[PDB]
Symmetry: C3
Subunit: 92 residues, 3 copies
Amino acid sequence: EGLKEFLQQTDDRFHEMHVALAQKDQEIAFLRSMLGKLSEKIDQLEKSLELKFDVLDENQSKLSEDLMEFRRDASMLNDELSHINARLNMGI
Amino acid sequence: EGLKEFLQQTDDRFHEMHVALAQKDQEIAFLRSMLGKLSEKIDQLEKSLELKFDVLDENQSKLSEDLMEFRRDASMLNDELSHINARLNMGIL
Amino acid sequence: GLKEFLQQTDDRFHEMHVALAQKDQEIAFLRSMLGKLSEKIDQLEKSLELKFDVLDENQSKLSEDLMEFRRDASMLNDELSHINARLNMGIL
């Protein structure tokens, strides 16, 4: 007869599973939070990139407009040069 | 024979464990798909960033090349004025 | 004697331990993928720091060149007026 010790052996086994499950709840919770930290880090990095990009886009536009404007001044200077070279051959 | 209710108590606990495990299957399934979306999102940002820098680098190169030609045109032009100024002191006055 | 059922529960506990053992694997991989992705982000942040400081200097260095070159353009335009003014002193 007897065999009543086995009743506790399964009761003990269920405690092992509850403890092992309790870690599983724990491990998943971090992975969730760790994932959230990365998605937050990425989204904020995206925001700083948009600003830092809009700045360099504006600077590229201001400098490139200046470059094209200076091409006009080269033509205006060249126009005045054609007049002068013709004028010097009009007399010593 | 003195506690047959325990026969059912274990059947209840096994059901608790199966559902609790079923949750773990779901949480990992969600975590897996969410992870894949992030790894894809990261991959797309890497590619789009490569372009926008390669784009602006071309503008920086073409704009700086424009400067180098314009300094040359300015240097030859400044030479052209110095030669002219030298001729003016040789002219009758 | 209900000894057939006592083993039936022992079998189910083995099923769960295997299912738990898989969960350890799935969590371990997901952990590493997070570390790899979080690693991918950090190098991307650093690479942006370098690539931005370069282009920011190039925009500043080129724009400083513009400011010097616009000065040189004004001196050139003055000397053309200088030459034309001397030619108008030959008439007079």
